[PDB]
């Protein structure tokens, strides 16, 4: 379903912070001893509400909370870092967790170019 922002207000601009693990360091800045303190490891950006994504994001995070809290209640792990990796695994199992039946609705295999590759050969055989 599409996300329906139902909040009293929406800040349409997202002034954000994050990190980058592939950050091209100049010289010795990548060496922990020489690099930035904890407060200086952040990049910043500004994202506007094109396609309504900012207001969608606020509503999505809001709606995620119940399921995320119920997950945290049931785990005995003190700090959970594994949610995204598990989602990537589930993405793969959904498609490849069983036999893939070509042309069936649960098999992400495109035989188009192979069907056409075969089709060009039969037209050649008929010419013979």
């Amino acid at each position: 379903e599409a996300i329906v922002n139902a909040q009293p207000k929406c800040n349409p601009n997202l002034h954000y912070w994050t990190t980058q693990d592939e950050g091209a360091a100049i010289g010795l800045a990548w060496i922990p001893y020489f690099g930035p303190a904890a407060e200086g490891i952040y990049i910043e950006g500004l994202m506007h509400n094109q396609d309504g994504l900012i207001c969608g994001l606020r509503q999505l995070a809001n709606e995620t909370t119940q399921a995320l809290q119920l997950f945290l209640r049931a785990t005995t792990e003190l700090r959970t870092f594994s949610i995204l990796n598990r989602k990537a695994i589930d993405f793969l199992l959904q498609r490849w967790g069983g036999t893939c039946h070509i042309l069936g609705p649960d098999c992400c295999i495109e035989p188009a170019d192979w069907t056409k590759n075969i089709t060009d050969k039969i037209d050649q055989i008929i010419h013979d």
Binding site: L93, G97, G98
Partner: peptide, 10 residues
């Protein structure tokens, strides 16, 4: 065994 189906971590 290809007949084995694992559809998710759940």
């Amino acid at each position: 065994v290809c007949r084995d189906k694992l559809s998710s971590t759940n």
